[PDB]
Design an enzyme around this catalytic site. Structure first.
Site, short mmCIF file in Angstrom:
data_model
loop_
_atom_site.label_atom_id
_atom_site.label_comp_id
_atom_site.label_asym_id
_atom_site.label_seq_id
_atom_site.Cartn_x
_atom_site.Cartn_y
_atom_site.Cartn_z
N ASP A 194 6.29 -23.22 -51.24
CA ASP A 194 7.92 -23.05 -52.61
C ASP A 194 8.29 -24.45 -51.73
OD1 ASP A 194 9.88 -22.67 -50.60
OD2 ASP A 194 9.90 -21.26 -51.86
N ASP A 196 13.01 -25.52 -51.05
CA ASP A 196 14.32 -24.66 -51.50
C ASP A 196 14.81 -25.77 -51.71
OD1 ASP A 196 13.49 -22.16 -51.34
OD2 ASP A 196 13.00 -23.16 -49.53
N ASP A 252 12.53 -23.26 -55.42
CA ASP A 252 14.62 -22.63 -55.86
C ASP A 252 15.62 -23.74 -55.48
OD1 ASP A 252 12.94 -20.55 -55.68
OD2 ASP A 252 12.57 -20.23 -53.69
MG LIG Z 1 11.60 -20.38 -51.49
MG LIG Z 2 10.27 -21.92 -49.37
#
Ligand SMILES: [Mg+2]
Ligand SMILES: [Mg+2]
Ligand code: NA
Length: 328
Positions: A194, A196, A252
């Site tokens: 992912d 961030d 995120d």
């Molecule tokens: Mg994350």
């Molecule tokens: Mg991450």
DNA sequence: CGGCATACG
DNA sequence: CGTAT
DNA sequence: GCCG
């Protein structure tokens, strides 16, 4: 010569004991699937000790005196050194329980508890879950629909494009607000699961109410395949361009006031084990309580002002480690 | 033996 | 319950 | 599972 806490030693992203650490992390993961958080922690810490060593372990005696190596972790290493394989680790790898819990917990919206319940109910495959969709949360439906894309590693080249579109939305939501890349990519990873991002504004208080405004703008641009919607953390699935098409990516977004930014940057840069170890060190060795918002002295009932991560390491009596050396 | 990080959605 | 490092 |  090896400190006991991971936050007391540099841990680079790549190291000299990769196979040994990977085996111990299988056992840590399996312990977590069974709810054994203490054993997970020990196996994680032992793996991390090996990542911090300056050269390969070649003989059992080189484990003597290393923290977090006792009878069990030492035997795992011994078998790997003698035979190239550890029977316990291979039995875990093959086991139906390990493979299914890994499959289920890697779905966005499914934790250990849900995966275990499904396992006990006899479920084993993603298509088993898709057959009974009325039992899924909306989050789990999104995680299952997008599971294939979310299993594909995000590349550092993907990150730059994502950061630009987040910055565009953030700048309309609140001129002057900034976007900082955190997580594994800030620690130097070339791939990740992912992306961030940490968002703030130089004028204290101006960041209040920011994340809803950012999300509504990203959603209006057609970029949000899933999000949960006052809030300050958003766990999203973004649409990322690809040649002739696109792919789903987990992103995120976190907002912090600038007074808390060093603490939030430190927390969200990780690694997960590094932050657990840092918070444990703070409380148990220094009597101070650390989180992603601040550092509290419970005797004076005061919070430590920090202008930088460097400040925080100094206030804990720790040598500074740059993000690239926090890969515990 | 107790302890194992600490939050927010 | 899930999520985050 | 390991530490203090
Ligand atoms: Mg994350
Ligand atoms: Mg991450
Ligand atoms: Na999950």
């Amino acid at each position: 010569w090896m400190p006991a806490y991971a936050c007391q030693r540099p841990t680079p992203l790549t190291h000299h004991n990769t196979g040994l650490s990977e085996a111990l992390e299988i056992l840590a993961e399996a312990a977590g699937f069974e709810g054994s958080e203490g054993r997970l922690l020990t196996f994680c810490r032992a793996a991390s000790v090996l990542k911090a060593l300056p050269s390969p372990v070649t003989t059992l005696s080189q484990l003597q005196g290393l923290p977090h190596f006792g009878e069990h972790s030492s035997r795992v290493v011994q078998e790997l050194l003698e035979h190239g394989v550890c029977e316990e680790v291979e039995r875990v790898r093959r086991s139906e329980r390990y493979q299914t819990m890994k499959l289920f917990t890697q779905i966005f919206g499914v934790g250990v508890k849900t995966a275990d319940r499904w396992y006990r109910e006899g479920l084993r495959t993603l298509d088993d879950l898709r057959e009974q969709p009325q039992k899924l949360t909306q989050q789990q439906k999104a995680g299952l629909q997008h599971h294939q894309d979310l299993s594909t590693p995000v590349l550092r080249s993907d990150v730059d494009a994502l950061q630009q579109v987040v910055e565009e939305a953030v700048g309309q939501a609140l001129p002057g607000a900034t976007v900082t890349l955190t997580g594994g990519f800030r620690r130097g990873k070339l791939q990740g699961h992912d992306v961030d991002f940490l968002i703030t504004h130089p004028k204290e208080g101006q960041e209040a109410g920011l994340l809803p405004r950012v999300m509504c703008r990203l959603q209006d641009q057609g970029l949000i395949l899933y999000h949960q919607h006052a809030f300050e953390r958003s766990f999203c699935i973004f649409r990322l361009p690809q040649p002739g098409s696109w792919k789903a990516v987990r992103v995120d977004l976190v907002v912090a006031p600038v007074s808390q930014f060093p603490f939030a940057l430190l927390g969200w840069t990780g690694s997960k084990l590094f932050q657990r170890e840092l918070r444990r060190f703070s409380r148990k060795e220094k009597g101070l309580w650390l989180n992603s918002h601040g550092l509290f002295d419970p005797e004076q009932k005061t919070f430590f002002q920090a202008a930088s991560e460097e400040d925080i390491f100094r206030h804990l009596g720790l040598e500074y480690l740059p993000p690239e050396q926090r890969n515990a």
